[PDB]
């Protein structure tokens, strides 16, 4: 091809990280407002950045969510992995849920107040998001790179919901890396009670 040293062809491989769905979650991005995590060839989660909300209250009834066991275990594991990875999550009024019937919808409120005064809620939520959808998340948030600590978007809400499997990937190749990246370092940046 390019014949390095006159004797080596430069060749490539691209890995089909789809065959991995049987053992590990794969994430990808649709445009910038939709990010998906699949947990097999049947179901998964949708993560969207929106300027509307579904839940208009402040409750997340986790105790009831576990008293009953109507939810998919892998999907709950992923929600936990995402949630527990948010650094410095001191404001709990920012999180609301509807765990009724086994259905999962979780909202994180990214609204400011104060933006310049970064590092409150939206930053930690969006940083976690960038890892879960890593590689397909770079166009979802504004001001990519620049800083590491003042991550912001035009959207007011991050909403995570349960969905069905469809290919769902148009902006990035499916990859296990986002989930795996948040699998480790699960307990960091945790404030005392």
């Amino acid at each position, epitope marked *: 091809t390019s014949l390095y040293k006159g004797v080596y062809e430069l060749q490539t491989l691209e890995l089909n990280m789809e065959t991995l769905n049987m053992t590990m979650p794969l994430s990808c991005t649709k445009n*910038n*407002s939709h990010h998906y995590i699949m947990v097999g060839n049947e179901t998964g989660l949708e993560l*969207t*950045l*929106t*300027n*509307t*909300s*579904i*839940i*208009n*209250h402040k409750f997340c009834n986790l105790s009831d969510a576990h008293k009953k066991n109507l939810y998919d275990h892998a999907l709950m594991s992923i929600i936990s992995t995402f949630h527990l990875s948010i650094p410095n999550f001191n404001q709990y009024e920012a999180m609301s849920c*509807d765990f*009724n019937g086994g259905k999962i*919808s979780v909202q994180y409120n990214l609204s400011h107040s104060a933006a310049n005064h970064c590092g409150t809620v939206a930053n930690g939520v969006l940083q976690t998001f960038m890892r879960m959808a890593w590689g397909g998340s770079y166009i979802a948030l504004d001001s990519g790179c620049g800083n590491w600590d003042c991550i912001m978007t*035009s*959207y*007011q*809400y991050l909403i995570i919901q349960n969905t069905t499997w469809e290919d769902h990937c148009q902006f990035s190749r499916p990859s296990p890396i986002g989930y795996l990246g948040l699998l480790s370092q699960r307990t960091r940046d945790i404030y005392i009670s």
Partner: antibody
Amino acid sequence: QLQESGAGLLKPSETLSLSCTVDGESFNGFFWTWIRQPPGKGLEWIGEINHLASTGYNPSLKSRVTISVDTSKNQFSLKLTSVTAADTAVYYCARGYSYGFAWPNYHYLDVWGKGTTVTVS
Amino acid sequence: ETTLTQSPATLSLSPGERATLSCRASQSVSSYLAWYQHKPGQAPRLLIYGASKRATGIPSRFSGSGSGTDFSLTISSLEPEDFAVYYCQHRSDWRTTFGQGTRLEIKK
């Protein structure tokens, strides 16, 4: 293609109690909206509800109105207690949608019921 | 919160003339306004959404635009069938309002 339809009655006192039965297409993808139009007035919003029973209301009706949903029959019923002379209006039930993505975003009510007339005589 | 005001409460042109109905917001509008057409005895019909989208069954006679706090509904030729009442609609997260309503009238 789709048509929303409700029920009600003239109601001199007590509670308004209006009902709306949803057509069979996409109950969970829309915000269910109740609006009102008193004679001589423009349109007023009463409140809105989704399939998770998450609601919002017109603050002036906060103490009197509660909107409920029952997904097992795709039917949501308006509720307005202490109904009075000021509530003598035509009520409508409509399907709404809000495209909260990127920019510009938008909102509208597309499928409308025919209108229920309620008075308090 | 925010409100809408429609200044041209009564507007009168003969059929066939072009006309517009303005609508102003108290704050830069979160989202874009929708317009509804209403008839004396029926139900409101969505005419335009997102300032400029004409939806489906609405004829090309109806168009519009807007941004910021200033929006406008344009009727290209006022067909006699269109001389009724128009309303502005605005939705914020879990809250929405309507304008006062403006009316078209046929004169001779």
